[PDB]
Design a protein around this ligand. Structure first.
Ligand code: NA
Length: 129
């Protein structure tokens, strides 16, 4: 599924991501924009052989099982495929564990490089929330 901007903002709010760990909803929408362009089916292979999955490009190195990432963990206790669902529940629950891990949203390199410090409220501007 390719979400609309406000449609994803509303879905993230419904699933309790708005101000989760102090990160306003625009931060989450911005990260999703640059990680996946709002596409739940986004996948990207890393040089190290891990894969990133879903709207927030969650990595098989630590967070999900894909059966093909040697030495990896599955700290969200999910198949990485669950992160590709039209239903964002698995991505949101796993992102809450990631952003709690100590470095906040810096875990998302595209958030650090493209969202951090910017006017992230622009990403929810106009949305009925
Ligand atoms: Na894994």
């Amino acid at each position: 599924k390719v979400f609309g901007r406000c449609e994803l903002a509303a879905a993230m709010k419904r699933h309790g991501l708005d101000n989760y760990r102090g990160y306003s909803l625009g931060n989450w929408v911005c990260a999703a924009k640059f990680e996946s362009n709002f596409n739940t089916q986004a996948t990207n292979r890393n040089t190290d052989g891990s894969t990133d999955y879903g709207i927030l490009q969650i990595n098989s190195r630590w967070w999900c099982n894909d059966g093909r990432t040697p030495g990896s963990r599955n700290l969200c206790n999910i198949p990485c495929s669950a992160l590709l669902s039209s239903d964002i529940t698995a991505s949101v629950n796993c992102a809450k564990k990631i952003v709690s891990d100590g470095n906040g949203m810096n875990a998302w390199v595209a958030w650090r490089n493209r969202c951090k410090g910017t006017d992230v409220q622009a990403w929810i501007r106009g949305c009925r929330l």
